[PDB]
Design a protein around this ligand. Structure first.
Ligand code: MG
Ligand code: ZN
Lengths: 195, 96, 48, 224, 97, 145, 93, 98, 448, 148
RNA sequence: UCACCCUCGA
DNA sequence: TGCATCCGTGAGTCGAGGGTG
DNA sequence: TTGTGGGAGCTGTCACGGATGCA
């Protein structure tokens, strides 16, 4: 379809194509069509249109473009919040965020080198897929496929793992914390005391 | 029963016993069948009939069927109120 | 389930080997059950 | 000898010179052995009765004899470790020379800066003197006054010396030391490594945990 | 001071105890030294600030491509960090400027 | 100083403009620190120029070490001379050769993109990870001609 | 009906009636929902994010561009503000 | 002994099941390294002396000390907030005596 | 440990045992590894004899200097070049092998440690009755679990079928595997004729044939790559019946030959799946729905048909310290074998020696990783002599190769009636490890 | 024939990427690093693919390329007490003349260059350096503590 | 200090 | 295009000590 | 930058609501 009838369309792979499908997209037309389906239709398709309208109408307010769902630039958390501390024998122990960002940077630089070197489109597609998967691991690891395993096969703590769970920020560090002017000890009975 | 039942109630889940209640006052028709009960309620006002489709004989009929009739186990032709439970078991709070 | 044979010996007389071994079943069953029961109660309490 | 959990493991001979021992006999007792048998506690005279609420709700009342006669006294050894290594500003040094420190507190230290065997240590006492080169980025303005006016050149260091943790006190039993100046296997960058062992004799006391073989536990509410 | 302990503190309705435990005792970087200084000099205990772990939470959300902003009463986003010039006056005074 | 009295706290998707507006620079290297000098490698994950000074009131190359100079940027090292307390609040960024999808909105159930474009998450999986192509747009006028 | 609501969606009874009050200047049915579902459906995205299923809550709250009023107790606990109960109430405070 | 006078502290035992799991007390200086707990407040804490430990928190601000003395004081909460019955009643040994 | 080494104490013991064939653990890994053949078959390398030099440092010195109590390990590596027909023997140094003390403990990096005997399910076939499908209908499942290799699973669905779930892949009808092993419809319809569920599965079969069954098994094993019948045959024959990628334990062969009774005439010559035992497993699975007591394989002997108990101490064995060390050594040595094969090409022939082919780095790394990071290598607990004594006799159900912590249900922790005289029902942790750690009984001993 | 050589590369070595990905994962235990390593091997192979000799079995060359490329691979208490002055260096500095005290401050504490100190104090260079050294001497005579 | 894992205590 | 099936979420609190990456 | 070459572990967990995806 590209060798013959090539100039007549545009089509692609990866996340660029999703960015395009968001670019050429009418939130008002799709939203009005969906709510029209909800109003007139009935059955399971009515529920499907409801579930889709709940997304589209939310995206239909005060800008808030769906373009945000695709990143051309990934923000980097400050280095203090991903500290790196020394060990015995010249070795160093770091956070998992640093290794995730490092994989992202490695695959991105390699993709740049492949683009400048005019590599086969298959190899460049492989590198693009690997970049997408690395950003996936950095944001929420284990959400798709097997999690990225550091040496020892332990799943790397992702940016989502810092919020999730009873040990995440909310539960462990925000709803309750360790305080100053506090102690503890073994309790023994004293009947001598007043109430 | 016990703590799982407390959780089932607080989470407003469709209970496992699934003991249905009456939808409308009126006459009751108790169908007989091997391993299965079927209930047909005819409203006293005369509105469209309502039908409770099937209940396994594992479930047992509600003990109380008394407004002006028998105070014993539900039988055929009894008078049913709006909220009188039809089977011995756990009622669905959404239906209630 | 209940075991058809009971433990006829009180702990003052002292249980035989078999009676003690049989008692261990329920003992550990309850010790383990309480560890999950407290977690269920705690999760429900958190949701409440 | 200190065990993994801090419990002292002594060994005492149970035989005298000239005794004829058959193969397999016990020659000397271990920590909790007595003439070859496991002895995990003491035989105490017990009375079973509520006493003025001091044994209420599983607590335990003890005779002060068990203190005076060292019946429940136990020896607890603990190991402290500190190493001088190479930093970005230079190398650390284990030395008695500690800036801004009195001679009185250093009195229990030898010329090396290590505490001397047999001294009694208290919370905050220096076990091993160690200085570390200071980057001078966090150097004090009033101290840069000193360094610039008096022309301090050679030694700009700070006190990283090892001290005794809170609530811990005892008698220094032994000290072992490994030096890069000598032939010893140490991790990269680590110049010197010194271990100080400290033993304490813990009498029985309020809060300590006593229990029998029958699952009857409890802490000591009061020792009359 | 865990989650259930805060549940208990709230059930008591003791608000200042819960705030003090959670701000000036744990996470308020400028409030900790303020409290120690105030008690040392025998003054009253000051007003709590912001938990630093909340700033860490906001930065963690920003690292997730979530644009988080603290709004004023009627105003726009509020600057959450502090200028470095607050600490120089007392130092230069202690050196006798 | 803050009185922790804020009326409302709002969130929203970060546009690439927002991400670049936040960042103080772009990390170009996988390097963390020079293992010989234990110093941050420039344009690395710990780079001092973009994130901030490791030590208080110091540039990288060591030409500026004082509280005298504050709020200025060293010309040789490109590091602002200020408190190291900024190293916890200064974000970087990474420019991507190819765009990527936020895995929250694709794999997060129900798939937010799958509801946005009315695509199946299986087909979206085929697309984003290069298992199948998809037509972005077509010229119907030229095709009909 | 007339007002701007999504059919099948759950809306607080007081807010539903109040919006309804504005209108005419809307067929609702009482629903029984579990404690988990009633907890995740609260108006405070911060509370819901701290409670359970943080990733989904944060995604949906980013899409809808929600703004937390910082009203409930747990929210003030998170931001370090004096809680709105007991001694923290403006009547006593 | 002077700085402690009339300065309450908070005693807590985990797990904290009800609000009575944290209670304010007037501290009395005691010889030894163990915390001495009144025997009537056990049932509230579900605290025994088979090896249990408890934590102490010192309120600092005037409002915190007032909340400790008024709201969370041990002798102020004698009734179970769940059932209204009274805990802090003679427990078992005490009863046997009576 | 004396078995792992092969000490003369262990030698004498074997004669008494009657297991006349004495073979140490290291000797066993050597016999499994030998020989190492190149892809051309021109050159082979075979390890023969394990030997131990005296210990490097005494226990006290080890604990003082933060060392590891170890002894040098030597092997006799004989290389043979078939092309030039030359033989070069040697004595190669494998590594410094951590040694067990007289108190039964180890010294790792200056700290005393104990290796806890791990509770793991023995290899074999295990049948279970899964009630509580969508409908009140008893569906019977069976798992064939080896000592090493790829698992095998046979299940039945809500709708009446029989399928093989192989390596977590989607369940393909078992007729695919039957015809893939060479069976034909007229042949398998005979043996399973009394089972209508198999007839129904063949009526619902997608394809009927041998080579296409091979190719479909291949495409099931192989994603994203083109299907081929030759690679189908190679992979399907290599995964199970080839002794390289598949280890059927001697314990596993014994369990399956006692459970299915196929070969009871002392044929322990080879430990691998026999096509007759897969036929027996499938016939057992389908006949278990009927549940007839006596069953006779075409060659089997009056086997009772019943589901298997997972917690029974006849189906639940324990890997002691020697077997755990052997299982880490096996992996290290396989990596060393990879290195040997890599060297055999690039190196100039007539310059190689058994010394230049062998790289002992992965074996040393494997042993170090085991004794340092393994869950079964535990910091020795010595408050008093008794704590250490029981710690050395503990039986732990958690660890690599056994069930994980989230897989521990109430039913694995309870006292089993087979624990009488084997595991003490009283001694066990009070906390989250309850039922997961248990002390060995007084008079009990571990089977070979 | 450069682009034609790249076309026959797309047609020849691409069927080998799966087999040698298995080969790269057979050495690197982490599959992600196996992907990275296969990508590096492919960049190396395509960079010098023109250098490659034409042969019957091309893939063994890539096998060696793969193996070679892999082998080539402070409490609030301390903070509150730090804020308080020394009240010994303080007193000694107070004893110095304010004119010389400010000079030794700017040139020693803050470390200005002498010309810049002269610019700050409005006084010429001679006055600044004289106050500097005289205040240095008087301060040296004022304090003998020297950290004890 | 950071992250795991292990064994314990109520 | 009706329904089974597969996927994602959740599963008590607070303490102590050790090891290794 | 040659000729050779298919991974390690797991699952012995359960209940529930909802979107996925098959046929
Ligand atoms: Mg207790
Ligand atoms: Zn510079």
């Amino acid at each position: 379809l590209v060798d013959r009838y090539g100039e007549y369309f545009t089509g692609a792979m990866g996340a660029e194509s999703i960015q395009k499908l968001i670019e050429n997209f009418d939130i008002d037309a799709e939203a009005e069509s969906l709510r029209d389906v909800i109003r007139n239709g009935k059955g399971q398709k009515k529920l499907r249109a409801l579930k889709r309208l709940k997304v589209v109408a939310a995206f239909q307010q005060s800008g808030n473009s769906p373009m945000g769902m695709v990143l051309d630039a990934v923000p980097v958390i400050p280095p203090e919040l991903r500290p790196m501390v020394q060990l015995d024998g010249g070795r160093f122990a770091t956070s998992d965020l640093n290794d995730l960002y490092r994989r992202v940077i490695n695959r991105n630089n390699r993709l740049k080198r492949l683009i400048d070197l005019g590599a086969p489109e298959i190899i460049v597609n492989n590198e693009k897929r690997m970049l997408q998967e690395s950003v996936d691991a950095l944001f929420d690891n284990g959400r798709r496929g097997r999690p990225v395993t550091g040496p020892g096969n332990r799943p790397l703590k992702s940016l989502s793992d810092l919020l999730k769970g009873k040990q995440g920020r909310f539960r462990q560090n925000l709803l309750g914390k360790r305080v100053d002017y506090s102690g503890r000890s073994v309790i023994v009975v004293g009947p001598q005391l007043k109430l | 029963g016990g703590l799982p039942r407390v959780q089932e109630l607080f989470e407003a889940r469709v209970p496992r016993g699934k003991a249905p209640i009456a939808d409308v006052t009126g006459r009751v028709r108790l169908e007989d069948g091997e391993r299965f009960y079927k209930i047909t309620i005819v409203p006293d006002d005369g509105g469209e009939e309502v039908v409770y489709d099937k209940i396994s004989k594992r479930q047992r009929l509600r003990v109380f069927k008394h407004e002006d009739g028998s105070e014993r186990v539900l039988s055929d032709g009894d008078h049913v109120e709006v909220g009188q439970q039809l089977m011995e078991g756990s009622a669905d709070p959404h239906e209630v | 389930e209940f075991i058809p044979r009971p433990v006829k010996s009180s702990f003052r007389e002292g249980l035989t080997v078999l009676e003690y071994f049989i008692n261990t079943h329920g003992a550990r069953k309850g010790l383990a059950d309480t560890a999950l029961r407290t977690a269920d109660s705690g999760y429900l309490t958190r949701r409440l | 000898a200190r065990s993994n959990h801090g419990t002292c493991a002594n060994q005492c001979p149970i035989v005298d010179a000239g005794d004829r021992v058959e193969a397999g006999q016990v020659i000397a007792d271990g920590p909790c052995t007595d003439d070859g048998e496991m002895a995990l506690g003491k035989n105490l005279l017990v009375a079973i009765m509520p006493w003025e609420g001091h044994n209420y709700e599983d607590a335990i009342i003890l005779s002060n004899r068990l203190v005076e006669e060292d019946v429940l006294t136990s020896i607890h050894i603990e190991e402290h470790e500190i190493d001088a290594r190479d930093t970005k500003l230079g190398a650390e040094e284990i030395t008695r020379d500690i800036p801004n420190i009195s001679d009185e507190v250093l009195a229990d230290l030898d010329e090396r800066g290590i505490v001397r065997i047999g001294a009694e240590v208290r919370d905050g006492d220096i076990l091993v003197g160690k200085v570390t080169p200071k980057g001078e980025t966090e150097l004090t303005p009033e101290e840069r006054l000193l360094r610039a006016i008096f022309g301090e050149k050679a030694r700009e260091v700070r006190d990283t010396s090892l001290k005794v943790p809170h609530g811990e006190s005892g008698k220094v039993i032994g000290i072992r030391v490994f030096s890069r100046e000598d032939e010893d296997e140490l991790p990269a960058g680590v110049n010197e490594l010194v271990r100080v062992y400290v033993a304490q004799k813990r009498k029985i006391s309020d809060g300590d945990k006593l229990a029998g073989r029958h699952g009857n536990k409890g802490v000591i509410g009061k020792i009359l | 001071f865990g989650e259930m302990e805060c549940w208990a503190m709230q059930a008591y309705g003791a608000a200042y105890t819960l705030q003090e435990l959670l701000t000036i005792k744990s996470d308020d970087t400028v409030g900790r030294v303020k409290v120690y200084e105030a008690i040392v000099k025998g003054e009253n205990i000051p007003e709590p600030g912001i938990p630093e772990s909340f700033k860490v939470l906001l930065k963690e959300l920003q690292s997730l491509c979530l644009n988080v902003e603290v709004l004023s009463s009627d105003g726009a986003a509020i600057e959450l960090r502090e200028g470095e010039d607050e600490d120089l006056e007392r130092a230069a005074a202690n050196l006798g400027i | 100083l803050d009185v922790n009295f804020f009326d409302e706290l709002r969130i929203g998707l970060a546009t690439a403009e927002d991400i670049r507006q936040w960042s103080y620079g772009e990390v170009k290297k996988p390097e963390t620190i020079n293992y010989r000098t234990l110093k941050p490698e420039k344009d690395g994950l710990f780079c001092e120029k973009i994130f901030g000074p490791t030590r208080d009131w110091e540039c990288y190359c060591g030409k500026y070490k004082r509280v005298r100079f504050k709020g200025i940027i060293c010309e040789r090292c490109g590091v602002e001379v200020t408190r190291a307390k900024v190293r916890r609040e200064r974000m970087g960024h990474i420019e991507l050769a190819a765009p990527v999808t936020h895995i929250w909105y694709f794999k997060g159930v129900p798939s937010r993109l799958g509801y946005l474009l009315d695509l199946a998450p299986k087909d979206l999986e085929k697309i984003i990870y290069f298992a199948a192509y998809v037509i972005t747009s077509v010229d119907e006028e030229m095709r009909h001609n | 009906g007339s007002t701007e609501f999504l059919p099948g969606s759950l809306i607080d009874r007081a807010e539903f009636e109040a919006e309804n009050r504005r209108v005419v200047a809307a067929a609702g049915r009482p629903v029984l929902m579990g404690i988990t579902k009633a907890s995740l459906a609260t108006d405070s995205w911060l509370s819901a994010a701290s409670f359970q299923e943080t990733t989904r809550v944060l995604t949906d709250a980013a899409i809808n561009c929600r703004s937390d009023k910082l009203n409930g107790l747990k929210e003030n606990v998170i931001i370090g503000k004096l809680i709105p109960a007991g001694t923290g109430i403006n009547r006593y405070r | 002994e002077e700085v402690i006078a009339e300065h309450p502290v908070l005693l807590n035992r985990a797990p904290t099941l009800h609000r009575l799991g944290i209670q304010a007390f007037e501290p009395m200086l005691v010889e030894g390294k163990a915390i001495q707990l009144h025997p009537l407040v056990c049932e509230a804490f579900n605290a025994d002396f088979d090896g249990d430990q408890m934590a102490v928190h010192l309120p600092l601000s005037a409002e915190a000390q007032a909340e400790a003395r008024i709201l969370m004081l041990s002798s102020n909460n004698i009734l179970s907030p769940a059932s209204g019955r009274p805990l802090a009643m003679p427990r078992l040994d005490m009863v046997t005596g009576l | 440990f004396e078995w792992l080494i092969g000490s003369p104490r262990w030698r004498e013991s074997a004669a008494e045992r009657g297991d006349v064939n004495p073979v140490g653990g290291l000797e066993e890994v050597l016999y499994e590894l030998s020989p190492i053949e190149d892809f051309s078959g021109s050159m082979s390398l075979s390890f023969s004899d394990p030997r131990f030099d005296d210990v490097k440092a005494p226990v006290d010195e080890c604990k003082d200097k933060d060392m590891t109590y170890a002894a040098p390990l030597f092997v006799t590596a004989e290389f043979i070049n078939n092309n030039t027909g030359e033989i070069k023997s040697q004595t190669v140094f494998m590594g410094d092998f951590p040694m067990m003390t007289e108190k039964g403990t180890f010294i790792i990096n200056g700290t005393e440690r104990v290796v806890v005997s791990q509770l793991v399910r023995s290899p074999g076939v295990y049948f279970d009755e899964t009630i509580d499908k969508s409908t009140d209908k008893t569906l019977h499942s069976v798992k064939v679990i080896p000592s090493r290799g790829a698992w095998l699973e046979f299940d039945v669905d809500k709708r009446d079928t029989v399928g093989v779930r192989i390596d977590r892949k989607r369940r393909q009808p078992v007729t695919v595997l039957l015809k893939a092993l060479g069976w034909t419809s007229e042949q398998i319809v005979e043996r399973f004729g009394f089972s209508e569920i198999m007839r129904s599965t063949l009526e619902k079969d997608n394809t009927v044939g041998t080579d296409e069954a091979l190719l479909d098994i291949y495409r099931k094993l192989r994603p994203g790559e083109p299907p081929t019948k030759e690679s189908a045959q190679t992979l399907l024959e290599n995964l199970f019946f080839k002794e390289k990628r598949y280890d059927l334990a001697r314990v596993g062969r014994y369990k399956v030959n006692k459970k299915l009774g196929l070969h009871v005439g002392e044929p322990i010559t080879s430990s691998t799946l026999t096509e007759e035992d897969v036929v027996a497993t499938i016939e057992y699975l389908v006949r278990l729905h009927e549940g007839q007591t006596t069953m006779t394989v075409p060659g089997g002997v009056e086997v009772p048909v019943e589901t298997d108990d997972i917690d029974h101490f006849g189906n639940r064995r324990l890997r002691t310290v020697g077997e755990l060390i052997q299982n880490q050594i096996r992996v290290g040595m396989s990596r060393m074998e990879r290195v040997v094969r890599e060297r055999m090409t690039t190196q100039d022939v007539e310059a190689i020696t058994p010394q230049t082919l062998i790289n002992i780095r992965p074996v040393v790394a494997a042993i170090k990783e085991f004794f340092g990071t393994s869950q079964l290598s535990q910091f020795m607990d010595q408050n008093n002599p008794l704590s250490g004594l029981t710690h050395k006799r503990r039986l732990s159900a958690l660890g690599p190769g056994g069930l994980s912590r989230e897989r521990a249900g109430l039913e694995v922790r309870d006292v089993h009636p087979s624990h009488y005289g084997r595991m003490c029902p009283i001694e066990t942790p009070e906390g989250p490890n309850i039922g997961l750690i248990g002390s060995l009984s007084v008079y009990a001993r571990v089977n070979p | 024939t450069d682009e034609e050589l790249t076309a026959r590369f797309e047609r020849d070595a691409i069927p080998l990427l799966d087999q040698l990905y298995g080969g790269a994962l057979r050495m690197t235990r982490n599959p992600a690093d196996a992907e990275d390593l296969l990508q590096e091997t492919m960049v190396k192979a395509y960079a010098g693919f023109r250098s490659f000799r034409h042969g019957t079995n091309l893939k063994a060359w890539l096998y060696r390329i793969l193996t070679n490329t892999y082998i080539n691979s402070r409490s609030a208490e301390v903070e509150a007490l730090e804020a308080l002055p020394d009240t010994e260096i303080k007193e000694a500095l107070q004893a110095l003349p304010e004119e010389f005290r400010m000079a030794v401050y700017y040139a020693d504490v803050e470390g200005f260059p002498y010309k810049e100190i002269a610019e700050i104090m409005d006084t010429p260079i001679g006055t600044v350096m004289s106050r500097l050294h005289r205040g240095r001497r008087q301060l040296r005579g004022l304090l003998a503590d020297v950290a004890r």
